[PDB]
Amino acid sequence: TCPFYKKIPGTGFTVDAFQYGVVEGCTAYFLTHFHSDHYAGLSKHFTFPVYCSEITGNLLKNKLHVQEQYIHPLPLDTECIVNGVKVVLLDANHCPGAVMILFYLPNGTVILHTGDFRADPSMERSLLADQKVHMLYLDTTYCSPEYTFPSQQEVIRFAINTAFEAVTLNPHALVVCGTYSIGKEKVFLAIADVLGSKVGMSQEKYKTLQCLNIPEINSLITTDMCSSLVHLLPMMQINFKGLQSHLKKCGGKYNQILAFRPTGWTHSNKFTRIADVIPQTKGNISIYGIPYSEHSSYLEMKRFVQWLKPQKIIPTVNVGTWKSRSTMEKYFREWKLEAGY
Numbered sequence: 001t002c003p004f005y006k007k008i009p010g011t012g013f014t015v016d017a018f019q020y021g022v023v024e025g026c027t028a029y030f031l032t033h034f035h036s037d038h039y040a041g042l043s044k045h046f047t048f049p050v051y052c053s054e055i056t057g058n059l060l061k062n063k064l065h066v067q068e069q070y071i072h073p074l075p076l077d078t079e080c081i082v083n084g085v086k087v088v089l090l091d092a093n094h095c096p097g098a099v100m101i102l103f104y105l106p107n108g109t110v111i112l113h114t115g116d117f118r119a120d121p122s123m124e125r126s127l128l129a130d131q132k133v134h135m136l137y138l139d140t141t142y143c144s145p146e147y148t149f150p151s152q153q154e155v156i157r158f159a160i161n162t163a164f165e166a167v168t169l170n171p172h173a174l175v176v177c178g179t180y181s182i183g184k185e186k187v188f189l190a191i192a193d194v195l196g197s198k199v200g201m202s203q204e205k206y207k208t209l210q211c212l213n214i215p216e217i218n219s220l221i222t223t224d225m226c227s228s229l230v231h232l233l234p235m236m237q238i239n240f241k242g243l244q245s246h247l248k249k250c251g252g253k254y255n256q257i258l259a260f261r262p263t264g265w266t267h268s269n270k271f272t273r274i275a276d277v278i279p280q281t282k283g284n285i286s287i288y289g290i291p292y293s294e295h296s297s298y299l300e301m302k303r304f305v306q307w308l309k310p311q312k313i314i315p316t317v318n319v320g321t322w323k324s325r326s327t328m329e330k331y332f333r334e335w336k337l338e339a340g341y
């Protein structure tokens, strides 16, 4: 059964609610982005209207084989009427195709559902600037002050310089980058660009990348592994055993691997600056964990919410424990008292 924080009161609408069977009263199912925890339940047999971005739509059709007659793509930054209700989709600064949804309720209430997002000050100049929001359904993944990490730009700078240094010293080194979902594609695209290489990958991952509307993509990626010195592998294979095994397969073309595991936050963020990050190393294999986040840090979240001044906040992440819920409510009250709304 569908939890309360996935329902939009005063509408026939749900958000990210595909794992519950047929939801009573739901005339339109919204999908914020193509991450498995959120799409869980969709398939080629789904027969209710799905509303989403163009990119999310490409992935539903090609990867999950949802039939085309049930896919309803909407442009961003554009007022649209769905089942008699005005909605807008906004870029969430999460993974490709990820949106926030603004719902203009018939009674005058305005609701923002952030989906998953990485708050940015650029959002303060979107169509959010123009009016008041009564209810915020908020991505609270990192809602605690211990959660700090660098900008995505600093993280990419570190990776480009690390990869370019290693391969310039040793032209026979291979770079490997882990992946398990869409998102974070800047990591491997920036590295391959500095090395003058295409990114090599499996046919399944190439297919996913072809759904994402990335400009000039055919120039950037390939399924011919032997022509490429940046390879993508599943995240689970980014360990000394999996990488040893991969180096065997390359037929004595390479004699060193430098690998990247993009993670979210890890507790080594509580002590170590990005510049100071060092790898784990065994023989001719080195593995870097890099804190590339597609979710708000604590300070980015705080800034966004203090700017928006919602009347009520409903968390969508870390809602399963009393301790989490209590912690989160304390911070919302601080933010409100500090800013005066």
Ligand code: NI
Pocket: 033, 035, 094, 116
């Ligand atoms: Ni996500």
